């Protein structure tokens, strides 16, 4: 119903539409019920044999069309049973959708809101909406820097609690100090706190400013001194 | 806080300095010295090797502890060669 309504707003009214669906795990549980009603034998994990296709039928209905000024964008939400990606619901979904945004129990239990972990998270068409004309000219360049520095900071953190604080080179210690400051101030904004794109980008610089000018090998001479504090 | 254990003739010169010098001769009370020498925080203890073959157990026990710093020394006659022993097996044990 919603997708048909969304298609009625975009393709026949020229509007940019955003669709949000919740829950998608509940959709499957109900999809299973009418299959046993038809006495159809389930394919895998108790879910019917057309689950992947049935998902694609209502997922793959999104995007622009040639000649028309419409737009349909979907953000389907699903609860992975017991935090597992290999489960049929989020696994099969991955073969259809481009990317994924994953929330982490460890983050939410640490007070992170929203508890989004960016490492397993992914957007396959992210570079299409970055760069001058759509966003700031350092968007792509910055993004990879914060990303690589986070992993390194997390690895510095894990070695710290096993070998002590002193075993770290004090710039691996600042990578660690970076990596928790990164989660507490950048990732954690609040469920009612809006952040415009520009406010987010220079925020990264403010955090990248912790790191000296020597390690930032993903950014070029135009942008590094045009934006860094 | 420094203690020393051994033969009076070789060790009493240490008494010129503030060293609680003993003259222990026993296999077990040498430990008893070292044990009371353990609950008082004497940083270093010097030991004539002649006395160390008596109570070898007690310096293997505190070996993993920092205090006391148990040290083998030759007396006026000579060492028993505890240096040749403990530096040889300790280097090979790790590597």
């Amino acid at each position: 119903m919603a997708l048909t309504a969304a298609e009625y707003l975009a393709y026949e009214k020229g509007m940019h539409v955003l669709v949000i669906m919740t829950d998608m795990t509940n959709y499957a549980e109900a999809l299973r019920e009418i299959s046993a009603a038809r006495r159809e034998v389930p394919g895998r994990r108790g879910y019917p044999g057309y689950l992947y296709t049935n998902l694609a039928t209502l997922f793959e209905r999104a995007g622009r069309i040639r000649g028309l000024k419409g737009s349909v964008t979907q953000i389907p939400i699903l609860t992975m049973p017991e935090d597992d990606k290999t489960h049929p619901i989020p696994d099969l979904t991955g073969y259809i959708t481009e990317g994924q945004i994953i929330l982490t129990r460890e983050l939410y239990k640490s007070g992170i809101q929203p508890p989004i972990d960016v490492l397993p998270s992914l957007s396959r068409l992210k570079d299409k909406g970055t760069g001058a004309g759509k966003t700031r000219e350092d968007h792509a360049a910055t993004m990879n820097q914060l990303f690589a520095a986070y992993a390194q900071g997390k690895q510095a953190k894990e070695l710290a609690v096993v070998l002590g604080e002193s075993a770290l080179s004090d710039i691996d210690k600042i990578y660690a100090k970076f990596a928790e400051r990164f989660e507490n101030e950048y990732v954690n904004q609040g469920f009612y706190t809006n952040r415009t794109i520009t406010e987010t980008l220079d925020l990264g610089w403010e955090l990248l400013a912790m790191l000296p000018r020597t390690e930032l090998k993903r950014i070029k001479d135009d942008l590094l001194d045009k934006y860094l504090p | 806080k420094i203690g020393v254990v051994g033969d009076k003739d070789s060790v009493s010169p240490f008494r010129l300095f503030g060293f609680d010098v003993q003259h222990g001769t026993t296999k077990t009370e040498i430990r008893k010295t070292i044990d009371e020498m353990a609950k008082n925080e004497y940083g270093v203890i010097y030991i004539t090797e002649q006395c160390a073959n008596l109570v070898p157990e007690t310096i293997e026990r505190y070996k993993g502890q920092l205090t006391p710093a148990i040290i083998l020394i030759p007396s006026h006659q000579g060492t028993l060669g505890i240096g040749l022993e403990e530096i040889q097996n300790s280097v090979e044990k790790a590597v």
Binding site: L163, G164, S166, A167 | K1, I2, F17, G18, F19, G43, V44, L66, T67, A69, I73, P74, G78, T79, G83, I87
Partner: peptide, 29 residues
């Protein structure tokens, strides 16, 4: 080299110490 040296010198032959124990992660030094 300290040990052997010590041996020779010893054989031919208020004052207390304070030992703060520094650290290198696992053991203290």
């Amino acid at each position: 080299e300290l040990r052997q040296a010590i041996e020779k010198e010893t054989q031919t032959a208020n004052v207390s110490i304070s030992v703060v124990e520094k650290n290198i992660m696992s053991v203290k030094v």
